[PDB]
Design a binder for this molecule. Structure first.
Ligand SMILES: Nc1ncnc2c1ncn2[C@@H]1O[C@H](COP(=O)(O)OP(=O)(O)OP(=O)(O)O)[C@@H](O)[C@H]1O
Ligand SMILES: Nc1ncnc2c1ncn2[C@@H]1O[C@H](COP(=O)(O)OP(=O)(O)OP(=O)(O)O)[C@@H](O)[C@H]1O
Ligand SMILES: [Cl-]
Ligand SMILES: [Cl-]
Ligand SMILES: [Cl-]
Ligand SMILES: [Mg+2]
Ligand SMILES: [Mg+2]
Ligand SMILES: [Mg+2]
Lengths: 494, 519
């Protein structure tokens, strides 16, 4: 780590945090549940106030139960109720309803304590939260927010190796100089962006990666600009892409074993769900856009073709996506919704298992017009390599009529998650990142030809300024904690 | 040079299993539960009303010092200043054997451009001066503290540590009266009511509570003495004078809560040390003399005349260190007043100036010291034989006219010192000069005493009282109160003394418990 940059991570005097008091969202769920540093500080406040001890420990124990192994749950349920739900107990939680205590004692299930969690957090949002606002712990939060809003641009990042190559520039592995955390930095050449009219795609990707927070979608930590580039610093994925691994796993016998395909399918679906729950259509799901990290967990990426539906918009028009992955509705010029992403999922799963597209044989020469005809007309056949479950699931996704296609219903994919293909998958543990991935992994092309005849107007500069919106709060807080900097700077008496 | 008040290891570990019982031992959970830091909103009125001077807040108030030093410790750039400050204090209170090497360590740590804790902010001249040279580093300390009072203090004012101080001050101002104290046994008896050993119910800290019956006070017109004792004990902070922690009132009594002294008083020890051969050995007498003098000196530096030094008013604590007490006859001289009139004191301890009706200063206390040292050594008054029947009028004549004789039990040093103090003419008498007793401390009686360690409470007393033993021998008619009384009682009962209160919170563990950020 560069000492120069670490020396700029210092908490400021309280006087410089005044303007922040007024300007910030001081809502409970925003500050104390969703912001990692806000959660840590709130919990500390609770830990130093004996009267709020029971609330805090039930909160942590419900979280510990939610993410525990199947084997250990029965016992943790029993310990919880003995600890918090009994009049006699030392950590008894008076503040709870008679009605809530009853239910929490009743039964055994995946979301056994979610009703309990809701009550605990509702209570925490009242008196305790107000006491928090009147404590040093909140002033310390303000100090952290101030630091969070300080300029952290180009100079803070050291590119040290090329991870990949895109249409507008390279993607680099880089180090955040101050903390040492590693990231991918996607560079987009400004002149090439302008000349090829890529502004909209650039911006939509950035907006989407900034507002969405899912362990199945690459996260944007920082957006900045340099003299020649726009830059997105995001989750580093060193594992390579699914497409590579389909054919590299075994050159002679390509394709994944069924369990491995199911696992990635489960992670991709969850990623799709997170987008669809936010009224976003991906429109570019395909194996080369699903990246593996160091542990072998996957995330979707490449959000430049996505679209965000407006408040109370249910469908959209737009010819976009990759030939072979675009659904009939889309190809036919019709209005479509999330349905197109589930079609893409089907093509994707199909290739994961068969090592070839549903509509063309492996390494076959097919121009776009014929591929469009195949997708609209050709029935997909399934080799012996498919199980009945995998066959049926793909069929359900590759249904040409969207109305008959399996997908996002009633605000979730919970129906889709019911398909026997996923019989062995634990969804609660998958969603929490607790499962063991099925496989764990272990060139100097040069520079692009500086494009000609590109001068910038104020409008271009303004777009660049708007793009380079700086630091994303949540990932920044996650970095501070992961990296040790929160620990070091938050000490009261070492 | 001041000490940093730290949690009392032993006391706090004896506290856990006193609490496990439901007996009087246990600190009362009700009162402990009222020791809680308030929300910041309640500290606003305090920001304006308080003295936020550097020396007052960060040097003299133990919790202020403690929080300022934490601020310095968590700010890397003020690291050198802090450690140099702590090391100068360590040097000042270290054994004579260890000093040479602590001096060298200090100069290598802080006074070298090369060193990692080098102190840039210092002068070339203070650096230079500090590399030469008691008092070796006083100039240096004054420069370190002068520096600390500027930028770093201003950064502290703009930090959470200052807000935390305000919180503690709020708690310091909250009502802590009669109901907070458990009287559990009787320590002694005075002119207006008993002195009790008492426990502060919230912290468990032990104290002496001196009770003065209101009616008996009025009837015997003892208000002035009550108030003078309380104001003096409140404003002075010496390890050689009993300290006032709280002043409150009850329906029947006025109450001073103060340093508990369980060792008994010097008079008792003169005669009970060996009933057949009474008196102290010379070294022991010198030791107490040096502690008494230091207490006199603190009073005299504040323009206070004690007027009641005598063996029965010098109390021992559990370690065997003594403090002066009983300040009801003292007088505080007004700004620019140099002397006073007034016939007060104990027959046989009052100096001729006083007895003759003349103006007098601190000189009378030194006469009293001489009488006291004489008795410590000889086991009898200079003016009367042991257990002799002498009425006041003749005692006054002896004190004015009789030359004191000295038996073989005195050394030449002891004899000379007492003669210096028992000079009948104040102008010829050894005592307070030029704002100190430094001149007096020069007498060879004190050859063996290390003054800086005495003054810092580091020396080992020559006699340690046994915690088993007690060193002391086994309505008022028709009085009503107008309002001059109610208002006097209200004014007397001025509540909590900040510094002893903060000392109590730190020693007793409560500062540590309530000051944690993340446990
Ligand atoms: N987070 C990441 N970590 C590591 N490599 C990445 C990451 N994101 C993208 N890449 C790699 O960087 C390159 C660019 O991928 P990306 O899909 O962002 O490019 P693009 O220019 O948007 O491509 P397209 O023209 O398909 O939209 C590829 O080599 C890709 O595998
Ligand atoms: N801090 C203390 N710790 C223990 N005992 C004390 C303390 N202060 C006073 N006493 C005991 O109580 C006795 C009476 O106290 P003190 O002499 O101060 O009261 P007083 O009424 O002023 O007496 P007088 O009127 O004779 O001066 C003392 O002789 C002593 O034994
Ligand atoms: Cl607080
Ligand atoms: Cl495989
Ligand atoms: Cl701070
Ligand atoms: Mg793209
Ligand atoms: Mg007395
Ligand atoms: Mg008295």
């Amino acid at each position: 780590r560069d000492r120069k940059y670490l020396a700029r991570l210092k908490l400021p005097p309280l006087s410089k945090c005044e303007a922040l008091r007024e300007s910030l969202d001081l809502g409970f769920e925003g500050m104390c549940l969703e912001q990692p540093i806000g959660k840590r500080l709130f919990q500390q406040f609770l830990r130093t106030h004996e009267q709020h001890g029971p609330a805090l420990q039930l909160w942590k124990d419900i979280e510990d139960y939610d993410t525990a192994d199947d084997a250990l749950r029965p016992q943790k349920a029993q310990a919880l109720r003995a600890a918090y739900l009994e009049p006699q107990a030392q950590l008894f939680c008076s503040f709870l309803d008679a009605e809530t205590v009853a239910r929490a004692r009743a039964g055994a299930g995946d979301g056994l304590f979610q009703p309990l969690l809701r009550a605990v957090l509702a209570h925490l949002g009242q008196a305790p939260f107000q006491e928090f606002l009147d404590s040093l712990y909140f002033l310390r939060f303000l100090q952290w927010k101030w630091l969070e809003a300080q300029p952290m641009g180009e100079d803070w990042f050291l590119d040290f190796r090329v991870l990949g190559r895109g249409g507008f520039g390279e993607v680099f592995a880089c180090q955040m100089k101050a903390t040492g955390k590693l990231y991918a930095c996607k560079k987009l050449n400004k002149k090439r962006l302008k000349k090829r009219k890529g502004y909209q795609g650039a911006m939509v990707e950035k907006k989407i990666l900034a507002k969405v927070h899912s362990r199945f979608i690459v996260s944007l930590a920082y957006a900045f600009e340099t003299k020649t580039d726009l830059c997105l610093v995001m989750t580093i994925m060193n594992g390579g892409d699914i497409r590579y691994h389909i054919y590299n796993v075994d050159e002679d016998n390509p394709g994944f074993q069924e369990p491995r395909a199911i696992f990635y399918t489960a992670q991709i679906v969850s990623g799709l769900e997170h987008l669809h729950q936010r009224n976003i259509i991906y429109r570019d799901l395909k194996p080369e856009n699903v990246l593996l990290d160091d542990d072998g967990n996957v995330r979707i990426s490449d959000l430049g073709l996505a679209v965000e539906l407006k408040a109370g918009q249910t469908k959209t028009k737009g010819y976009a996506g990759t030939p072979g992955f675009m659904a009939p509705e889309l190809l036919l010029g019709e209005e479509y919704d999330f349905s197109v992403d589930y079609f893409a999922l089907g093509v994707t799963l199909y290739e994961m298992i068969a090592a070839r597209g549903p509509f063309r044989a492996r390494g076959e020469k097919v121009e776009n017009k014929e591929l469009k005809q195949r997708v609209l007309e050709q029935a997909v056949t399934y080799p012996d390599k498919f199980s009945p479950a995998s066959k049926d699931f793909c069929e359900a996704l590759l249904q040409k009529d969207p109305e008959k296609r399996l997908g996002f219903r009633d605000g979730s994919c919970d129906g889709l998650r019911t398909h026997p293909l996923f019989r062995d998958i634990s969804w609660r543990q998958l969603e929490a990142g607790m499962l063991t991935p099925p496989f764990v992994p272990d060139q100097d092309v040069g520079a692009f030809s500086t494009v000609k005849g590109v001068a910038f107007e104020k409008a271009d500069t303004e777009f660049f300024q708007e793009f380079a919106s700086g630091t994303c709060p949540i990932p920044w807080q996650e970095e501070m904690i992961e990296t040790g900097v929160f620990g070091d700077l938050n000490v009261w008496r070492p």
